[PDB]
Amino acid sequence: HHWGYGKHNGPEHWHKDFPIAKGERQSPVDIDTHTAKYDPSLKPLSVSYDQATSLRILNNGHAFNVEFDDSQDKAVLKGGPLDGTYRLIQFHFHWGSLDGQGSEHTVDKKKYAAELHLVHWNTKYGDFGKAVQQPDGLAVLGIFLKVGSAKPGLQKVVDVLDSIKTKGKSADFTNFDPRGLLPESLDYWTYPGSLTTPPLLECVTWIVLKEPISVSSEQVLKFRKLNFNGEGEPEELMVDNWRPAQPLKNRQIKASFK
Numbered sequence: 340h341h342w343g344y345g346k347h348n349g350p351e352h353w354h355k356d357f358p359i360a361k362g363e364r365q366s367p368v369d370i371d372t373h374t375a376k377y378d379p380s381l382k383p384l385s386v387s388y389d390q391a392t393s394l395r396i397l398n399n400g401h402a403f404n405v406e407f408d409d410s411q412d413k414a415v416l417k418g419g420p421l422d423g424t425y426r427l428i429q430f431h432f433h434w435g436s437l438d439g440q441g442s443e444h445t446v447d448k449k450k451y452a453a454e455l456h457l458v459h460w461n462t463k464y465g466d467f468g469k470a471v472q473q474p475d476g477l478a479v480l481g482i483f484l485k486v487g488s489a490k491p492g493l494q495k496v497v498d499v500l501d502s503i504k505t506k507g508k509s510a511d512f513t514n515f516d517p518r519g520l521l522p523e524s525l526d527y528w529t530y531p532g533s534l535t536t537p538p539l540l541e542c543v544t545w546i547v548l549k550e551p552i553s554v555s556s557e558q559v560l561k562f563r564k565l566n567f568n569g570e571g572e573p574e575e576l577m578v579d580n581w582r583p584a585q586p587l588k589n590r591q592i593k594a595s596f597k
């Protein structure tokens with residue numbers, strides 16, 4: 340597969356290799372704040388990242404992934420809409436060429452400058468590859484980024500980016516604390532959806548935080564210096580690595596808050 344985000348291989352083309360692109364629970368979606376309903380049954384959300392062990396950062400040609408040791412329950416997400424225990428495996432971002440776009444989810448059609456995805460898998464399926472074949476296999480925590488004041492907890496990530504400019508490059512990235520990327524509030528919207536890139540599997544419980552985090556223009560500018568291409572290939576800046584909003588179909592978005 341040669342999928343990407345260009346005119347010739349971007350989201351509008353994905354359905355030819357990945358027909359589930361036109362399925363019934365595709366992501367991202369627009370979150371219409373006037374139609375999402377508060378759900379009193381949602382249990383409290385539990386983000387337990389104190390024992391998180393980051394290992395590595397990888398430019399995969401689509402984004403950069405900060406990977407974690409998920410061989411044990413070190414950093415987990417529970418509660419909210421979730422049954423059981425979901426283990427953190429990696430986080431990454433989607434961002435724009437300009438500050439007015441870059442997020443995958445939208446809020447009343449608003450596009451944020453970027454969106455962080457913290458990806459976790461359901462430990463009852465044993466491994467991540469099995470989990471992505473299940474409707475409740477993954478829980479993705481999605482956090483919007485707006486451009487304003489710098490996020491101090493992001494700066495170790497931005498500073499390593501020069502070392503992984505091109506596709507296939509990785510770097511050691513130990514001791515990074517993902518709690519520094521969270522907003523103050525854990526108020527969220529939740530709905531059933533999918534992976535937002537190929538293979539587009541319909542295996543995700545989406546948990547999208549209402550409160551965005553602020554990053555500086557300098558921080559996001561450094562994201563935009565990455566490359567989709569590999570070393571020694573023609574330079575294509577890693578920008579606009581987001582899929583647009585997909586049809587909601589037969590789904591309800593629930594709010595954790597009133």
Ligand SMILES: COc1ccc([C@H]2OC(=O)NC2=O)c(OC)c1
Pocket residue numbers: 456458479533534535536537538
């Ligand atoms: C192999 O594991 C994957 C594959 C794709 C996605 C895409 O779905 C998403 O929401 N962002 C993505 O890059 C993923 O993240 C959950 C994890």
Ligand SMILES: [Zn+2]
Pocket residue numbers: 431432433456535
């Ligand atoms: Zn993502």
